């Protein structure tokens, strides 16, 4: 809750696994596992964490070269060149989840273009 960071809670995070043989590993906010949180630091770093474990971390600075993002409603798909993952924002209503997503897009968009399908 600093002026140093922006944070949003995620319903779920899916890591694309092909870049047995699962396609996705899917993480959710649990009372035991920990809350799923997307963090953007004012310095330009992006994290996804579940409790203490960092599932994703990289710089958004000069990311126009190697990072693609697409928004669909309350979801984002991220592609780095290769790695891929998707995220859905949480909320009591479809509207609150979209409000969360949109506020996040507003921060991401300072660093990279967030595209539509």
């Amino acid at each position: 809750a600093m002026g140093e960071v922006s944070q949003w809670s995620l319903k779920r995070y899916g890591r694309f696994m092909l870049l047995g043989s699962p396609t996705w590993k899917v993480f959710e906010s649990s009372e035991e596992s920990g809350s799923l949180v997307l963090t953007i630091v004012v310095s330009g770093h992006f994290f996804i964490s579940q409790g203490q474990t960092l599932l994703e971390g990289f710089s958004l600075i000069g990311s126009k070269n190697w990072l693609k993002i697409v928004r669909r409603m309350d979801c984002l798909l991220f592609g780095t060149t290769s790695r891929m993952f998707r995220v859905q924002f949480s909320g009591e209503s479809k509207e609150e989840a979209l409000e969360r997503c949109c506020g996040c897009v507003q921060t991401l968009a300072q660093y990279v273009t967030v595209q539509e399908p």
């Binding site: 669909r72 592609g79 998707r86």
Partner: peptide, 15 residues
Amino acid sequence: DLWLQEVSNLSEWLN
């Protein structure tokens, strides 16, 4: 190709 494919498959999570 795979990207474009997974942009559409993001519907798996949508209502």
